[PDB]
Amino acid sequence: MSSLLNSLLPEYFKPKTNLNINSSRVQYGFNARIDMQYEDDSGTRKGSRPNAFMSNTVAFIGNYEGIIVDDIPILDTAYASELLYKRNLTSLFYNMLRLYYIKKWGSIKYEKDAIFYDNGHACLLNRQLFPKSRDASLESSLSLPEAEIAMLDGLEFPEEDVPAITCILGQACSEFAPLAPFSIAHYSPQLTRKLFVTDFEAAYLMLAQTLVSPVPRTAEASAWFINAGMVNMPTLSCAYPDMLFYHSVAMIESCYVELGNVARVSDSDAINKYTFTELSVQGRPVMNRGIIVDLTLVAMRTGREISLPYPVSCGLTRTDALLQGTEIHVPVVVKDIDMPQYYNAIDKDVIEGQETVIKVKQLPPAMYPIYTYGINTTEFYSDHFEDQVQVEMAPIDNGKAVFNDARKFSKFMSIMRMMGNDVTATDLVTGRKVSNWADNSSGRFLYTDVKYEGQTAFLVDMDTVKARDHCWVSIVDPNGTMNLSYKMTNFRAAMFSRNKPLYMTGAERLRAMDETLRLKPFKITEKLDFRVAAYAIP
Amino acid sequence: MSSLLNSLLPEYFKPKTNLNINSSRVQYGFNARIDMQYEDDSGTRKGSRPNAFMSNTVAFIGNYEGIIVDDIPILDGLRADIFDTHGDLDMGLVEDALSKSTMIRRNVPTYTAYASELLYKRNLTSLFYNMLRLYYIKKWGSIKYEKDAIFYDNGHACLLNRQLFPKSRDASLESSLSLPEAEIAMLDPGLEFPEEDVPAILWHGRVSSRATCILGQACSEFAPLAPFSIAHYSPQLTRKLFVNAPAGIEPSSGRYTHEDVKDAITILVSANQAYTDFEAAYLMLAQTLVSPVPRTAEASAWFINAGMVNMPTLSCANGYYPALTNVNPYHRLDTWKDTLNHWVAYPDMLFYHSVAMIESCYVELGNVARVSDSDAINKYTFTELSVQGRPVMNRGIIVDLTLVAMRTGREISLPYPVSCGLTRTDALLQGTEIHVPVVVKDIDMPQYYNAIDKDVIEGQETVIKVKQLPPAMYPIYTYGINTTEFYSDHFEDQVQVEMAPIDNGKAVFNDARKFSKFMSIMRMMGNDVTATDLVTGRKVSNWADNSSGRFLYTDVKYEGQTAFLVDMDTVKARDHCWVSIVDPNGTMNLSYKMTNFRAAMFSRNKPLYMTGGSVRTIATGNYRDAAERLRAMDETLRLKPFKITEKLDFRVAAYAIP
């Protein structure tokens, strides 16, 4: 559905036809201009950040598995009556589209002993997260066999379990058995053995989910991509190409941003992680799985009613790591000796080179809003164009300021980050050090960087406030009530690949509203807690 | 359907009966008067071509291959009593009808049991199709096909008949086929149980000595030597054919003329009551009679791989049940005999109906190939939304009739949703590169064409890579009835190229639309312009055709960014009856006007004239008013007298009327 996914892109950005991708990693963002204005009891200070780059990172690596399931027929004598109620060519077009992009971008290298995430304290290699893998190019990954394409001559009885519609059709129907973990070369079962000689729209949306996978914002956000997500491919029965990259990035961003909020919803409300899809959908699908889950999250993001002609339930299901009451064991590598102080590690004493495991209870946000920046602003992300943040500074006793409240602590470290001051605080309950400079790519502070669900009080170190990036606005000693008023203008999209700039080249409405799928949006209603999110009907 | 194919012909076109075709190539078109004008700051330069010939070359060659498929039964012909209110064979009235007939009493119970299967075997389209091809093979039998002949030539690239059609020996159309005869046995009325998988037909009186030879050859394999359009490959329809004729079948004569095939068809349709079957066969042949010679060298991608013809299996069970066919048949539409009556009167009119259909299709497939897949009505799903019936499979005539509906902009209605004939949209739906062979003439070829080699000596066999399919025909019969801005087939048109004196003749066209109109109108004025793309570095020439004399944007042979540098001091006068651009300064304004239209046809570089009587628009009413009249003049020989009258001379006699 082109017109749907085309709407998600920002109004200022209009991409060109061709895009020569020559790597397994692409940064995308914008170069904005920030005009900050500071006021406190000491006096006033005015500055301006001339060029600030806010970006996510997306890759072509994601462990997926295919299952053949029975879905609804797309309707767009004895034998005909049995066959017409199972007609679906979506699975055939899906494989034909994957073969197109394997040949086009068939020079992408996957190295086994490469980095996946790297902050400075911890590190994840591609040996971990993807065992049973070797070093191979994308063209060298698959060695597809060929199914028998026979000619249908007068034959009176249709042979059962064979559809009726050379090298491309032969390989499209065959089994996919990859060596390197690639997004568009994932394991798929055999469609058919023989093949005698709106369905495309389903396959187009189904590939937009799979094509690219997010590189995690922090080390804790690797918990999403441990367990292999299942791709529901329908059973095969019948009786501007490069623009897909931008539509795919737009879709997976919208899903992984909104799951950041759904994860924080308490399991004692009307709309919760279990019963959010069922309340949203207003059709009759086979099961609330695949695309229905993803398009529900896009509706919640944009805040508009999305509509498909047929209630199709085919594609990747992401909400698997979310729907289980168990802490997830992310395997990590120790780079600095002081790692156990920051991350919730099993072994409290470690050495540089040791392979340990960290515990993740609540799933943090995997991506920050970039394309969907300021279309609807929540208090959690605080992705405003114009905003006036007001916070009251705690009394500095010796060289330490106690922040008992949770909301005030979030606003304080959010200001000091925009000014460009690397502040480090100690959580009193756990006894672990939090830092506002957690993510370098996106220049903002989320409350999930604390890495402790529940209630606590923070002891901020005001003496050891380092000066990483200093504009004229930037001050070290706050006094009384802190007011910061910033304005964002002059947005321009920029893409980076392999640490260099990647440039773009080239009569009556018979309603019939009974069978059609409709997805209703939910609006976030902020409340006093700030740690908990809550949904309501608009 | 004679009616819908008749409306496609232009208003000025007044056709006659006979057309004496004596070659395998015809240039149909029209003569128009073009009043061109070139306005500039210096002054205006007027021109006028009184006879401007816009033509589309059409040949009698084209690779096709027949396959026998299963299609719906056509129920028009059977008596109206056995049918129910809804319109399906109510079995129970069939048993009643067979009982009250002149049938053998011991056969009634065994024949009634078989009726459930055999009565739904009614499709004679395959037989009529082959018998129509035999008519035209014997009529236009003297046309020749040479092996080492020029299929296409534009000066730069040449394409021979050896390249497209291998396994091809040079021979005349008459000497191409050597048809073996199938057995025509006589049906014994006292047969115990009907033999299914063997069709039995009806006949009026005695099967003549020549009718045996025609039916024998019609139900046989076509194995041609030369690749002719009306003598393409067809499988064996049947091995044996029963004929329920009480008067015995005479043995095969061996020889027959084209007039004897018309005699065979008229008896077969009348006896079997199969007029809707003939209408299907008429539309099938209309597609696959003539194929278009490609407009450009790179427009040969349509005719590389052989397009499959869908011939429905020969199945008829009228011979076993003579009682069920009578003088009161069941028919859906009242105008169900119009297609046969038109063919019997004017056989040669099919040539004009054929070119009208292929010109309508290949024009629309031109501007269908230039739409992105990400759209509602696109390459794959343009047939499904248009069709409002229940055909078995969207192929054959359904795909060709829906393209005609888009061209004319009207609603086409058929009585039965039959899916038989040629399927054209084959190379389009594949959506891959096609490798057309070419023999080079000049040495500077691969700058213009997207060739595989960059340096090629003259007389070398190379390959051109065609990605997007260019239009194979230009609209001529459908000129300015449903106009689009791509073809730009207007009566009046103008273009404004804006230049300043500071620029020394050099103009850059940022817009793609007005670049197309400038290059096209300059060719009417007889000027050889050669533009060069600034981004890529390729070259395009407006002189890329010798038939229509227009420039379509698909002649660039590349989709990219638009920056065409045209140097206006290298413009060369090529043709006669031309306006001169000696040295332009300031803003240029080109314009033309087409005023009158006269139908013209060419063959062997000579005028081909239409002869015979004046063709009329035959209606159902025009014959049945003479049936209403009946010639009701009582057939009584009333002789009236003449009174002799005497005058001055008296030697000579003079008779008066009263």
Chain A: nearest CA to B313, how far in angstroms? 7
Query: d(Cα B519, Cα B515) in Å, to the nearest integer?
Result: 6
Report the b/e string of A190-216 with b at 16+ CB within 10 A.
ebbeebbeebbbbbbbbbbbbbbbbbb
Name the residue with tokens 């129910």. Answer: B84
Neighbours of A116 (CB within 10 A): 19
CA dihedral A94, A95, A100, A105 (to 10 degrees): 100
Query: d(Cα B408, Cα B405) in Å, to the nearest integer?
Result: 6
By C-alpha distance, which of B287, B258, B289 is closest to B26? Answer: B289
Q: How far is CA B179 from the centre of its chain?
A: 25
Is A69 in a helix, a strand, or coil?
strand
**Residue B296 φ then ψ, to 5°:** -110, 170
Q: Which residues of A touch B561 (CB under 8 A)?
A: 506
Query: d(Cα A314, Cα A292) in Å, to the nearest integer?
Result: 8
Q: Kindly give the pairing relationship between strand B606-607 and strand B37-39.
A: unpaired
Instruction: Verify whether the Cβ–Cβ distance A2 to B374 is below 8 Å.
Output: yes
Instruction: Verify whether the Cβ–Cβ distance A240 to B70 is below 8 Å.
Output: no
Neighbours of B212 (CB within 10 A): 21
**Helix, strand, coil distribution of chain B in percent, nearest 5:** 25, 25, 50
Is A268 in a helix, a strand, or coil?
coil
Q: Is the CB of residue A466 less than 8 Å from the CB of residue A432?
A: no
Alpha helices by DSSP H, listed for A316-369, are 339-342
Query: d(Cα B579, Cα B57) in Å, to the nearest integer?
Result: 28
Q: Which of A154, A200, A506 sits opposite B380 (nearest CB)?
A: A200
Report the b/e string of B72-101 with b at 16+ CB within 10 A.
bebbbbbbeebeeeeeebeeeebeebbeee
Q: DSSP state, B532?
A: E
Beta bridge partners of A519: A281, A306
Query: d(Cα B572, Cα B529) in Å, to the nearest integer?
Result: 7
The residues, any chain, with a CB within 8 Å of residue A45's CB and separated by 6 or more, are A38, A472, A473, A475
Chain A: nearest CA to B389, how far in angstroms? 13
Q: Extract the runs of DSSP E, i.e. beta strands, from B467-604.
A: 492-497, 506-509, 527-528, 530-533, 539-541, 564-567, 572-573, 588-603
Q: How far is CA B480 from the centre of its chain?
A: 21
Element (H, E) at A39: strand A37-39
CB pairs A-B closer than 8 Å:
20
Instruction: Verify whether the Cβ–Cβ distance A2 to B68 is below 8 Å.
Output: no
By C-alpha distance, which of A10, A13, A494, A21 is closest to A242? Answer: A21
Radius of gyration of chain B (CA): 30
Alpha helices by DSSP H, listed for B337-450, are 338-345, 350-368, 383-386, 397-408, 427-430
By C-alpha distance, which of A307, A256, A242, A253 is closest to A280? Answer: A307
Q: Please give the C-alpha separations between residue A465 and each of A419, A421, B377, B498, in angstroms, as whole numbers.
A: 12, 6, 62, 65
Instruction: Verify whether the Cβ–Cβ distance B561 to A2 is below 8 Å.
Output: no
Give the strand order in the sheet containing A433-435: A400-403, A458-461, A424-427, A433-435
Is A99 in a helix, a strand, or coil?
helix
Residues of chain A with a CB closer than 8 angstroms to some CB in chain B: 2, 76, 153-156, 198, 200, 204, 240, 243, 506
Radius of gyration of chain A (CA): 26
- Cα of first residue to Cα of last residue in chain B, in angstroms, is 53
Instruction: Verify whether the Cβ–Cβ distance B373 to A154 is below 8 Å.
Output: no
- Which amino acid makes up residue B312? P
Report the b/e string of A100-111 with b at 16+ CB within 10 A.
ebbeebeebebe
Q: Is the CB of residue A52 less than 8 Å from the CB of residue A204?
A: no
Question: What's the sign of the alpha-carbon dihedral A251, A257, A261, A262?
Answer: positive
Q: DSSP state, A363?
A: P
Query: d(Cα B520, Cα B514) in Å, to the nearest integer?
Result: 10
Q: Is the CB of residue A149 less than 8 Å from the CB of residue A155?
A: no
Token pair, residue B157, equals: 């690239």
Query: d(Cα A265, Cα A248) in Å, to the nearest integer?
Result: 27
- Which amino acid makes up residue B620? T
Instruction: Verify whether the Cβ–Cβ distance A153 to B68 is below 8 Å.
Output: yes
Q: Is the CB of residue B342 less than 8 Å from the CB of residue B349?
A: yes
Which of B374, B383, B558 to mutate against chain A (most A CBs within 10 Å)?
A: B374
Report the residue numbers after which chain B has a gap, meaning the C atom sits over 2.5 angstroms from the next written residue's N, or none: none
Q: Please give the C-alpha separations between residue B406 and each of B167, B373, B383, B385, B403, in angstroms, as whole numbers.
A: 38, 19, 11, 12, 5
Q: Extract the runs of DSSP E, i.e. beta strands, from A195-327.
A: 213-214, 229-234, 306-308, 315-316
Give the strand order in the sheet containing B183-186: B183-186, B240-244, B200-202
Alpha helices by DSSP H, listed for A63-137, are 78-83, 90-104
The residues, any chain, with a CB within 8 Å of residue B52's CB and separated by 6 or more, are B31, B32, B33, B34, B524, B549
Element (H, E) at A426: strand A424-427
By C-alpha distance, which of A104, A178, A111, A51 is closest to A498? Answer: A111
Q: Please give the C-alpha separations between residue A76 and each of A87, A515, B67, B253, B382, in angstroms, as whole numbers.
A: 10, 13, 28, 55, 12
Q: Please give the C-alpha separations between residue B170 and each of B224, B225, B227, in angstroms, as whole numbers.
A: 11, 8, 9
The residues, any chain, with a CB within 8 Å of residue B18's CB and separated by 6 or more, are B348, B610, B611, B612
Query: d(Cα B5, Cα A442) in Å, to the nearest integer?
Result: 67
By C-alpha distance, which of B166, B300, B306 is closest to B234? Answer: B306
Report the b/e string of A319-355 with b at 16+ CB within 10 A.
bebeeeeeebebebbbeeeebbebbebeeeebeeeee
By C-alpha distance, which of B285, B283, B181 is closest to B236? Answer: B181
Instruction: Verify whether the Cβ–Cβ distance A154 to B68 is below 8 Å.
Output: yes
Query: d(Cα A80, Cα A32) in Å, to the nearest integer?
Result: 60
Q: Which of B70, B384, B560 sits opposite A76 (nearest CB)?
A: B384
Query: d(Cα A417, Cα A240) in Å, to the nearest integer?
Result: 41
Neighbours of A356 (CB within 10 A): 17
Chain B: nearest CA to A206, how far in angstroms? 15
Beta bridge partners of A505: A18
Q: DSSP state, B360?
A: H
Beta bridge partners of B606: B603
Q: Which residues of A touch B67 (CB under 8 A)?
A: 153
Q: Extract the runs of DSSP E, i.e. beta strands, from B604-657.
A: 606-607, 611-614, 644-645, 654-655
CA nearest to B66 within chain A: A153
Question: What's the sign of the alpha-carbon dihedral A338, A328, A446, A267?
Answer: negative
**Helix, strand, coil distribution of chain A in percent, nearest 5:** 20, 25, 55
Q: Is the CB of residue A485 less than 8 Å from the CB of residue A249?
A: no
Token pair, residue A345, equals: 């590690």
Query: d(Cα A489, Cα B288) in Å, to the nearest integer?
Result: 65
The residues, any chain, with a CB within 8 Å of residue A390's CB and separated by 6 or more, are A411, A481, A482, A483
Instruction: Verify whether the Cβ–Cβ distance B374 to A240 is below 8 Å.
Output: yes
Token pair, residue B654, equals: 């003079």
**Residue A244 φ then ψ, to 5°:** -60, -35
Query: d(Cα B152, Cα B351) in Å, to the nearest integer?
Result: 22
Chain A: nearest CA to B399, how far in angstroms? 16
Chain A: nearest CA to B5, how far in angstroms? 28
Query: d(Cα A84, Cα B390) in Å, to the nearest integer?
Result: 13
Q: Extract the runs of DSSP E, i.e. beta strands, from B148-269.
A: 150-153, 157-160, 171-172, 183-186, 200-202, 240-244
By C-alpha distance, which of A297, A300, A282, A290 is closest to A517? Answer: A282
Beta bridge partners of B26: B58
Is A499 in a helix, a strand, or coil?
coil
Q: What angle do CA B556, B558, B564 make, to 5 degrees?
A: 55
Q: Which of B67, B69, B372 sits opposite A240 (nearest CB)?
A: B372
Three-state helix/strand/coil letters over A366-423:
CCCCCCCCCCCCCCCCCCCCEEEEEEECCCCCCCEEEECCHHHHHHHHHHHHHHCEEC
Q: Kindly give the pairing relationship between strand A229-234 and strand A64-69.
A: parallel
